[PDB]
C-alpha cells in the first residue's frame, strides 16, 4: 500500500527568456512507513498540445519528503505560457506554470515588499521572495515605503550611505535588507520596482535642495501649498507641480539614484488622486491631470538614457473608472511599461470594472493592466469573540451606548490592574489578525498592553473618536499561532493610559469567495491584481504594511492555482491579439442555469473572446452573489453537468473543445466530447460543462 502526495511543484525562476533552461521541482512526500520506488513522469503542455515528456525512477524513504527535479530547455519562441505536470502515480500529482517572456511588462504579476527591518536576514529576505515567485509566479515586486524621505530617497552622511534610516511612520529601514531583497528578486528573474511619488517632498524641503517656487497651491497668492497633514504638527508631505521642469530635474535624479545605487529595475510612481482648483506659485491655474503625462514621459526618457535595461516605469491612475480623472490622459499618452490603477468606488460592479479595463486597453494599444483593488476593505469579518462574554478582571459589562454587537460591551476599563481575556480557537498554524472593536471619547489616545498565551506581545494604541457611540475596529495586531486554544489578553498595566470600551475581538480573515471571483473577473477581462506580498501577506488597505486581515490556507491554495492558471493560459488571457468577440449575449446558452452576458447578479456570466487561433468562452459563476467585486461573498451555487451551446460562424473551423479551470484538476486542460448542429437561432457547438464553481474557461 504505497501512499503520499505531491505537496508543491515549482520552477526555479518566475519568468524565462526563450531558450533558458527551466528546472522544475516536485516536493514529493511518502506517507507510508517504508520507502517507495517508482516512476515520476513530467508532462509539459502548451494549451491543448503535449510538447515534452520525461521520466525517472526515484526512491523516497518512509515519512520523507524529497525534491524530484527535471530540467527542460524552453522553446525558442517568445511569450508562451506552459503547464508542467508531475505525476508520481500512487504518491499523487501536481502542476506548475512556466512563463517564457523576454519582457515581464507583457505579463506582469505584481506583488509587494513593505518590510525592510534590520533583523531580517538574507535567508528570510530570500524565503519571502522565493515563496511568492514559486507559489504565485510573481515576476515583479513593488518596494513600498523603502525610501527615507519622499524627495531624498537614500539617506547619506556625506558620501557614506547610512546603514539604517527612519521613515515617515518612524519605521527602521535597513539598506542591506533592501539590497538583499532586490538580489533575491533578480535571482527569480524578477523586476524590483521602487515606490516613489510623482510630486511629494517632506517637511523642511528647502534644506534638501527643493524650491518652494516649484510647489502647487490652493490659491493664486502662493499662501497655502497643497499638503498631507499626518496630524502630529510636524510630519507633512508637500505637493509640487509635475509639469515644472526643475521639479522634474530634481526628482528624476532621485529616481536615477535609486536605480543606480540600489539596482532597482524601475520606478513605481504614485499619486494622491483628484485635486481640483490648483495653481502654481505665480497664481496660474493648472489643468492638473494634464501635467502627469509630460512628467512620466520625461521620466521614462531620463531613465532610458541612464540604463535601458533598468528603465521601467508605471504610474498609478487613482480612482479608476471609464473617463476617470487622468485616466484617458495617462493610458492614451504616457509611456508606462504597463498600466496600473487603484480602484475605489467609481467602478463598483464587475461590468463597470470590465468596461474600465477595456478602455485602458483600447487607449493604450493593449498594454497590460494591473489593478490595486483592496479586497474586503474595512469589513470586520472573521471569527468573532464578544468582549462581554470573555474573562473580566476589574472591568464590567454594560449596554448604555449605541453600536455594540452581541448583548453588550466591556466598560470600567480605566485603571491599572484591569484586563479583558479572550479565549480563542484557531483551526490551523498560521498568521491571525487580532482586530479589536472599541470606543474612546477620552479626548486622547488610550493604550493597552497585549498578551498572548500569558506572554507580552506589544503595546496597542486606541485612537480617540468624536463620541462614545462612534466605534472603531482600526486597532489590530497580527500574530503567528499553532492550532487549537490560545488566550488573548488586553491589559491596563501600570504606564498605560486612557479609558476605553471594548466590544469584541475578531480574527480578521480575507474572504476567499469574493477574492476568487474578483481575480477571475479581472483575468477574464485582461487585467491582473496587485494583492500578494511579503510571506504570503495580502493587501487589506492602501498602507501596505497593514495586517488587519490574514489569509487562511484554503485561500492560499486557491491563489496558487489561480496565479498558475493565469500564467499557463496567459496567451489566451493577456496577449495583445486577445479581443472581445463582437456578438452579444445570445452567443451562449446554458440549459436550465440562469446566465447573463453582462455580469448580472446571481447568474453564470459568460464572456466570449478570441485570438487569431482560438475562440474562448469564460464562465464566471455569480450564482448566489451580487455584482459588486470588493465585498465579501457567499460560496457560489455549485453547478454540475451544464448542457452548453456556443453559437459560432458557419465558416469557423473546429478541431476539439478544451476546458480548463483554476478550480479543478490542477489547471490541466480537458478535451470534452461535443457535437455540432444548427437550430432556429443559428450554428452551434454543444457540450457538457462537468462543473462550474468560480471560473471555467473553454477554448477551441
Ligand atoms: Ca459586544
Ligand atoms: Ca459581490
Ligand atoms: Na440559461
Numbering used by the authors: 40 to 739
Give excerpts from the publication.
CI-producing bacteria produce CI glucanotransferase (CITase; EC 2.4.1.248), which catalyses the production of CIs from dextran by intramolecular transglucosylation, and also catalyses disproportionation, coupling and hydrolytic reactions. CITases and some dextranases (EC 3.2.1.11; displaying endo-dextranolytic activity) are classified into the glycoside hydrolase (GH) family 66 (GH66) based on their primary structures, according to the CAZy database. Paenibacillus sp. 598K uses CITase (CITase from Paenibacillus sp. 598K (PsCITase)) to synthesize CIs from dextran. The core PsCITase structure is composed of four domains, the catalytic domain and three β-domains.
The crystal structures of core PsCITase and its complex with CI-7 (PsCITase–CI-7 complex) were determined by the molecular replacement method at 2.20 and 2.60 Å resolutions respectively. The structural model includes one protein molecule in the crystallographic asymmetric unit. Apart from the sugar and water molecules, one calcium ion and two sodium ions were observed. Some malonate ions were also observed, which were included in the crystallization conditions. The catalytic domain (Domain A, Asp141–Ile420 and Thr548–Asp614) comprising the (β/α)8-barrel is well conserved in GH66 enzymes. Domain C, positioned at the C-terminal side of the catalytic domain (Pro615–Met738), comprises a β-sandwich structure and is composed of Greek key motifs. The overall structure is conserved with that of GH66 enzymes.
